[PDB]
Point group: D2
Chain length 242, copies 4
């Protein structure tokens, strides 16, 4: 079983992703195409490269080209420092190949929005927010109920369990209105296995607290991504390239 | 002189803007093309239509197609309700014709970012922030100094002085890194007068307050223009 | 009734057309944006500008941005000079606003192909070729029969008669296979009146013999566009701008 | 050494090429993505896959996605049947990776035109036409002289000499005027070795004869490569 991605496999993956992104008019700078942009969620997912990104097999791997991750702390009243972490601005292009997924997880602080650029996006989520402490949270526009899962959702071997709570389904396409995924909601998505092209989606969200002189002292060592699956939640950061 | 835009002028202006937006893959739905998307900053700016959007003359008029304006209040701890207005997510596509401007102004709460999609964007701004309300504010990544203005910029007649404080300049093109304009910073921008195409820019910013997620958000004004006339021209577009 | 297009109307029309073309990646050079690119088929069609290109009213007006019109005579055996006029290469982008048409006509020498870039193209044609002299013409892939006209085809006032022979219908969209319109076939097309965008179509055809040191002596003064309507066939060239 | 391309390599090569084509708005239908769209010009060129399409090494391999290849015989006077083969309409999208080439060759009948869609195209050609068959040919707009080759062009190993006769050079970019390559002219092209993206070019040409509209068209060969090996690599792609 694969334990890493070869330099050739990785370079071709990111190069073709960056080329497709540019063709779609997403602003890609050299610095954005790095050894951290191609993500493998769990060591058991490197097996995705045994047959490759066009095998159409179910695995949790994807490319993220981040053009923006602005704290938006400047100008913020000091009195609001405690919750600045729920704000900020992040713009990234996500490229997911046929049959692949962005694994089940939720964010305590980050709210996201999706805009499909190419292909079709199958989003899976929990209409109800996870309970985070004895917090008295605000409400305004709760997540829509959505529809039940369609037929054809091949889940990654050994991870099917982590998708159990994501009962709601919505399929997004280019030209559709923006879709918002409120913070504290379990979610995941995949590119249909029969898709002729990789799924390309622009995500505009609040600040992304992920490992990679902090905006605020309290922001140091802050992880805002909690995955359901252990393999992904505990040990999914850096990408092993050999 | 012009006191309003004709129905035909408005329809062609927004129909072509929305068509260009769609060609550039921006998600445009019907409710986005409305009576307020074509903005004229002041009654004296309707004269921009005496010769049209391809006259290359300096006027402050533009189209904004907003695909998202999410409060992002859901899930936020009640304890942060007081400053939730500084957050949120807004996505809009701005179309500015040759020589036209988005006039000098600042936002107390909204921080923006620019991504040029078509054409080139000339940004004029003040690198030092203004103080709006609360004295003690946070700081992390101050606005860069950019460069001084280039020669030959044509400003709108009678609005020249309003640009005096925006001494820094940067010219953005497609493919460039995202440019951030922190809240409380005076800024403005134009499409070069000699541009072959209209300037098209995607703006990703915090919530856009335009007269509710929270009680205190009601009737909140977050756009302060330097020119008195420009403030007036932002309420409603006069379409004859 | 309108007798010409104002300089402002014309410049805005061509400028927005060239901008849209560039946005769609069609190579537009300054020389391609000229006073002949915006075409009005007949003096009775200038009325299209009484209410404008977004009035959605039926008129025969359009923009043609020609990036190529190559004789392809170079290297051709002298023995084939007699029929070089049926060859050549022409690449042009056609932009037609909601409800507007490219008027009924046929070409004796030019064969065309269509590739919709934006919007939807409603093509009207005669499945059978017009008879041009006692010619013994070649055959290989005759025009498909197509379907009958749909409901919603508002024809230009005073020209509805010229559309009578174009009995076959086909609706083209972006991503569809290339559609070929063989020479000697009456044809026309329009952008649906309810379209949210102007119809943008790339036409790749054989040489376009239209008024504007000839490739071949016999090519001088050669017109290959025969329109059904008199107003268009006799007096539709130059565009009157005032 | 490599004697064929692996199934996975071929699938990823064409799937990414077709995806890029679609993103660039080229009309790709299923029958266009086939076992002959990924071309390897010679058995010695399969080595291009030893390190891959992003190795930036000079090899003669490319993908061609043909959306149209119309004989244009319908309606043509029978009297012109003898030279109908010099006409017709072909539309194809060519994708060439960094440092890769479309090898030196000429067509007796096909005249082509290039429109760069993504990246930059370096064209090497002979401005003087070769004589193929008939002596008396027509002339109107001779190929321009272009410029001499720029410094540093890396050629495929063992194929260097085949480029000797293509002394003229032109570099084409997106938005440039269409470039015409008349029939009977030796030509070749590559994507710069340092290009950040694959070169994507739309070719509009007369009919592409590849082994019927007319009896005489059967088994017609209209591609003559300078390198003997390159001629061999054009028949069928070895996919293991
Ligand atoms: Mn997420
Ligand atoms: Mn602003
Ligand atoms: Mn025609
Ligand atoms: Mn060739």
């Amino acid at each position: 079983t694969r334990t890493a991605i070869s330099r050739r496999e990785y370079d071709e993956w990111l190069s073709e992703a960056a080329s497709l992104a540019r063709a779609l008019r997403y602003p890609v700078t050299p610095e954005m195409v790095n050894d951290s942009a191609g993500i493998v969620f769990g060591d058991d997912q490197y097996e995705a490269f045994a047959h490759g990104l066009w095998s159409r097999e179910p695995y949790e791997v994807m490319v993220i080209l981040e053009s923006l991750n602005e704290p938006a702390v400047d100008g913020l009243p000091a009195a609001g420092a405690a919750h600045a972490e729920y704000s900020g601005l992040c713009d990234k292009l996500m490229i997911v190949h046929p049959g692949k997924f962005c694994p089940p997880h939720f964010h305590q602080r980050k709210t996201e929005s999706y805009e499909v650029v190419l292909g079709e996006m199958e989003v899976f989520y929990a209409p109800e927010p996870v309970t985070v402490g004895d917090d008295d949270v605000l409400s305004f526009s709760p997540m829509p109920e959505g529809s039940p899962w369609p037929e054809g959702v091949a889940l990654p071997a050994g991870r099917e369990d982590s998708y159990a709570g994501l009962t709601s389904y919505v399929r997004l396409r280019a030209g559709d209105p923006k879709f918002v995924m409120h913070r504290k909601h379990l979610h995941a998505f995949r590119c249909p296995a029969d898709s002729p092209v990789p799924l390309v989606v622009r995500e505009v969200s609040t600040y992304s607290h992920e490992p990679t002189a902090a905006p605020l002292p309290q922001w140091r060592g802050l992880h805002d991504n909690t995955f359901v699956a252990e393999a992904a939640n505990s040990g999914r950061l850096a990408t092993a390239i050999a």
